[PDB]
Design an enzyme around this catalytic site. Structure first.
Site, mmCIF file in Angstrom:
data_model
loop_
_atom_site.group_PDB
_atom_site.id
_atom_site.type_symbol
_atom_site.label_atom_id
_atom_site.label_comp_id
_atom_site.label_asym_id
_atom_site.label_seq_id
_atom_site.Cartn_x
_atom_site.Cartn_y
_atom_site.Cartn_z
ATOM 1 N N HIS A 14 68.402 19.889 60.360
ATOM 2 C CA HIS A 14 67.045 19.775 60.950
ATOM 3 C C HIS A 14 66.968 20.508 62.291
ATOM 4 O O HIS A 14 65.907 21.018 62.599
ATOM 5 C CB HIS A 14 66.660 18.307 61.117
ATOM 6 C CG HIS A 14 65.993 17.739 59.914
ATOM 7 N ND1 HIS A 14 64.637 17.633 59.812
ATOM 8 C CD2 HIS A 14 66.495 17.279 58.754
ATOM 9 C CE1 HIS A 14 64.323 17.134 58.647
ATOM 10 N NE2 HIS A 14 65.438 16.896 57.991
ATOM 11 N N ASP A 107 59.616 17.766 64.377
ATOM 12 C CA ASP A 107 60.078 17.570 62.985
ATOM 13 C C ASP A 107 59.157 16.553 62.313
ATOM 14 O O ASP A 107 58.836 15.529 62.943
ATOM 15 C CB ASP A 107 61.554 17.164 62.962
ATOM 16 C CG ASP A 107 62.174 17.373 61.598
ATOM 17 O OD1 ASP A 107 61.695 16.728 60.636
ATOM 18 O OD2 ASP A 107 63.029 18.253 61.495
ATOM 19 N N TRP A 347 68.243 23.217 51.276
ATOM 20 C CA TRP A 347 67.156 24.175 51.595
ATOM 21 C C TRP A 347 67.640 25.323 52.473
ATOM 22 O O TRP A 347 67.257 26.431 52.215
ATOM 23 C CB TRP A 347 65.967 23.471 52.234
ATOM 24 C CG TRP A 347 64.788 24.370 52.390
ATOM 25 C CD1 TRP A 347 64.117 24.668 53.533
ATOM 26 C CD2 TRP A 347 64.138 25.095 51.342
ATOM 27 N NE1 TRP A 347 63.085 25.521 53.263
ATOM 28 C CE2 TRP A 347 63.078 25.803 51.929
ATOM 29 C CE3 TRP A 347 64.349 25.208 49.971
ATOM 30 C CZ2 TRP A 347 62.233 26.607 51.180
ATOM 31 C CZ3 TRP A 347 63.510 26.002 49.231
ATOM 32 C CH2 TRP A 347 62.470 26.694 49.832
ATOM 33 N N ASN A 348 68.508 25.020 53.430
ATOM 34 C CA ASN A 348 69.007 26.031 54.397
ATOM 35 C C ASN A 348 69.855 27.067 53.635
ATOM 36 O O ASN A 348 69.580 28.266 53.788
ATOM 37 C CB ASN A 348 69.715 25.378 55.590
ATOM 38 C CG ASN A 348 68.798 24.505 56.433
ATOM 39 O OD1 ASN A 348 67.634 24.848 56.689
ATOM 40 N ND2 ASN A 348 69.282 23.331 56.806
ATOM 41 N N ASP A 368 66.671 16.709 47.847
ATOM 42 C CA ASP A 368 65.745 17.817 47.501
ATOM 43 C C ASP A 368 66.515 18.899 46.743
ATOM 44 O O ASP A 368 65.875 19.819 46.246
ATOM 45 C CB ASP A 368 65.068 18.421 48.733
ATOM 46 C CG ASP A 368 66.041 18.863 49.811
ATOM 47 O OD1 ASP A 368 66.893 18.040 50.186
ATOM 48 O OD2 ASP A 368 65.910 20.011 50.289
ATOM 49 N N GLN A 369 67.846 18.833 46.730
ATOM 50 C CA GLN A 369 68.685 19.904 46.144
ATOM 51 C C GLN A 369 68.289 20.109 44.675
ATOM 52 O O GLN A 369 68.357 21.263 44.194
ATOM 53 C CB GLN A 369 70.170 19.569 46.290
ATOM 54 C CG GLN A 369 70.697 19.719 47.713
ATOM 55 C CD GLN A 369 71.910 18.849 47.950
ATOM 56 O OE1 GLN A 369 72.756 18.701 47.074
ATOM 57 N NE2 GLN A 369 72.045 18.344 49.167
#
Length: 450
Positions: A14, A107, A347-348, A368-369
């Site tokens: 984050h 955030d 995500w990164n 979320d992967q």
């Protein structure tokens, strides 16, 4: 000179996206203060040496920190109460100073920041650091069109691909945290009505339709991603090769010399994530699957995980496998010898694969992967998901076949062609006059109008 506050959530994964956006803003002449905790300032060197460097504002005394005895709620209720008072205390001073801040970008995971901005009459915008796709999912869970247990075998959300249950975030690896996680995730969309803008770590070519849907919720949505250093995209920010704000302090690397001696596009780069803890059975199937391909691989795996590798594994792959505790993922992915990226689909790492034009073998693990992996395979079409069994165990053959399909199979050329395209579009978006550059230009002009 225009001053803003940027307030990331204090967790690795984050902080980087906001630091990277903060660099694009200072490069367009915005003065940025980073609001953060005693803990983050102790473990990261955030202070550059220059007149335009991000100013580090520690607003906490460390008493808000996570205890290892805590139930997720306890960690979050405490963080919120203490950080709410800390921000209020900080703004009580900042707002009556010489040049008070004109904005707070926070955030999205800290929506309670909006309420504080509202009390102080301070313009504010949440920053959604993960995919826009996951903004759709969490919004739908919040407003009841989607349940925590999916109510159907196919989910058709507006302006989204068809999703199966196994494409939806699985937040239940700790069946004690699951509800806490979901309430925290759904609470990032409740107060958007009072947001000046909604910032998204994505780009219009990647998630255009979903971003257009989000714009219907009634607030301006600004795509400003990918938040990957400039040196790997448009290269308009001198020295931007790393995620951080202070001058890069290189580790001693063995990885790049090793990659230098392997054929162009030949090696599998393996990383199932710096935070993932993988069980020994799955770890062994992964290791033997990689070995059974006969391809050159570089595997970065931290010492506590490496401990769990099959006893003779590293020795058995002396020729073909470099298994090491650390490399620069950005430098590894950018290396011409790297042809494929076996990833957990965080995500990164997803944005880095897209930005650096490397086809993927998607081995998503949590959260979320799974949704990131669905887009990489079925939407952006830059590789394939390892098929997993009913038990969730991916066999060595399913690991081997997936790697072979992505690197050698019928659709291999297509994966590489599509990866080179997404690399172009990613650079386009953040380069001068790009969709993302234009959102950042627009924001900066708005700020300058105080």
């Amino acid at each position: 000179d225009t001053h803003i506050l940027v307030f990331p959530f204090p967790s690795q994964g984050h902080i980087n996206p906001l630091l990277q956006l903060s660099k694009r803003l200072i490069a367009k002449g915005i003065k940025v203060s980073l609001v953060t905790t005693l803990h983050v300032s102790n473990h990261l060197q955030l202070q550059g040496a220059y007149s335009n460097s991000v100013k580090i504002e520690v607003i906490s005394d460390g008493s808000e920190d996570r205890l290892e005895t805590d139930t997720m709620r306890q960690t979050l209720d405490r963080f919120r109460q203490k950080m709410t008072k800390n921000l209020e205390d900080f703004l009580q001073k900042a707002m009556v100073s010489s040049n008070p801040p004109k904005f707070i970008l926070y955030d999205s995971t800290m929506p309670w920041v909006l309420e504080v901005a509202k009390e102080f009459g301070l313009d504010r915008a949440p920053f959604y650091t993960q995919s826009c796709a996951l903004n759709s999912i969490n919004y739908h869970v919040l407003h009841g069109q989607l349940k925590l247990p999916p109510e159907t075998p196919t989910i058709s959300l507006p302006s989204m691909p068809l999703l199966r249950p196994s494409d939806l975030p699985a937040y239940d690896f700790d069946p004690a945290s699951t509800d806490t996680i979901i309430d925290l995730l759904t609470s990032q969309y409740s107060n958007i009505q009072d947001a000046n803008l909604l910032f998204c770590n994505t780009f219009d070519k990647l998630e255009g339709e979903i971003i257009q849907w989000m714009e219907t919720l009634g607030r301006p949505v600004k795509t400003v991603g990918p938040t990957v250093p400039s040196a790997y995209l448009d290269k308009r920010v001198e020295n931007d090769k790393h995620y951080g704000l202070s001058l890069f302090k290189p580790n001693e690397d063995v990885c790049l010399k090793w990659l230098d001696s392997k054929p162009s596009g030949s090696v599998l780069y393996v990383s199932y994530g710096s935070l993932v803890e993988m069980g020994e059975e799955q770890l062994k199937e992964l290791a033997l699957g990689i070995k059974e391909t006969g391809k050159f691989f570089l595997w970065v795996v931290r010492d506590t995980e490496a401990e769990k590798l099959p006893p003779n594994f590293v020795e058995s792959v002396a020729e073909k496998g470099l298994v090491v505790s650390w490399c620069s993922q950005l430098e590894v992915l950018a290396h011409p010898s790297v042809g494929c990226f076996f990833t957990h689909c965080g995500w990164n790492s997803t944005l880095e694969a897209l930005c650096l034009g490397v086809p993927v073998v998607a081995f998503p693990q949590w959260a979320d992967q799974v949704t990131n992996a669905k887009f990489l395979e079925d939407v952006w079409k830059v590789g394939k998901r390892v098929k997993r069994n009913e038990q969730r165990l991916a066999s060595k053959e399913e690991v081997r076949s997936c790697i072979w399909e992505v690197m050698e199979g019928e659709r291999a050329s297509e994966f590489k062609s599509n990866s080179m395209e997404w690399k172009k579009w990613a650079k386009e978006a953040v380069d001068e006059g790009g969709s993302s550059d234009k959102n950042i230009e627009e924001f900066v002009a708005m700020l300058k109008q105080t």
